[PDB]
């Protein structure tokens, strides 16, 4: 499993594509998203590619380290946490991500898992609420799909 | 992995919910799906995870070991091929599968694949032309998913 793609689906205008691709020990995520409200939103890995109730039976973080919410390049992070993706006036994102926690295969594979994009801005946990700690403060999943297998 | 599930969707009225479970050594399929046309329908494991372009983006029939297409009970058949679902009078086909050749783990894994729909019957690989020994000529895919893991 070397690459993957997501495609991103909600209940309102916002849409997008993300690919990933397996680089060393780190895989590489890029792709862009449209219809975002200006600024920031978290982008994360949750733990269900259940996608029966829409974006919420995704599930929480991907989490299997058992840590606490943080940023990227946190060592107190979920494994799905990717931080945040920003918006330009038009309301449009350009995903550019490396990530070394994150794989495309065995323990850490988030093949089959969903990708949710954030109403709000994650804050990396340090929000000072113990939600900061859990979900970054992020809020509702504007749009999510499960993570497959490409060519 | 040891739960699936796939939420199958399209430019139609066909929708369903498939669920996978690994029981013992083998892999239960069970689930339903609506707005179909009565009688069989073509039921197969596309390759890729891609819904980028529809169900079209999903690529052939996943076929790790390069044979022809086939019944579920035939030597000769990809491991994707599944057979037919069938439709009632009032359009809902109810899905109870067993297979020996998928897997929700390992080089099997349809983990992150796409489980596809399609308009017509599936021949079963004994049509008579190419067309049979590729797909079946089960036609069009009305409805597909991405595979992803479950509670
Ligand atoms: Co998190
Ligand atoms: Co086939
Ligand atoms: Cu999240
Ligand atoms: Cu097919």
Same mark, same amino acid.
């Given at each position: 499993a070397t690459k993957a793609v997501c495609v991103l689906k909600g209940d309102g205008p916002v849409q997008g594509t993300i690919h990933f691709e397996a680089k060393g020990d780190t895989v590489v995520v890029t792709g862009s998203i449209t219809g975002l409200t200006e600024g920031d939103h978290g982008f994360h890995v949750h733990q269900? $590619?259940?996608n029966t109730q829409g974006c =919420? #039976?995704?599930?929480?973080?991907?989490?299997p380290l058992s840590k606490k919410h943080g940023g990227?390049?946190? !060592? !107190?992070?979920?494994? $799905?946490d990717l931080g945040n993706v920003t918006a330009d006036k038009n309301g449009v994102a350009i995903v550019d991500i490396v990530d070394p926690? %994150? /794989?495309? /295969?065995? !323990?850490? #594979? %988030? %093949?089959?898992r969903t990708m949710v994009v954030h109403e709000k801005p994650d804050d990396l946990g340090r929000g000072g609420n113990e939600e900061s700690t859990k =979900? $970054?403060?992020? $809020?509702?999943?504007?749009a999510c799909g499960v993570i497959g297998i490409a060519k």
């Open positions: 269900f $590619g259940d =919420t #039976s995704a599930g929480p973080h991907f989490n990227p390049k946190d !060592e !107190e992070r979920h494994v $799905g926690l %994150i /794989s495309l /295969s065995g !323990e850490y #594979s %988030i %093949i089959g =979900t $970054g403060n992020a $809020g509702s999943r504007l």
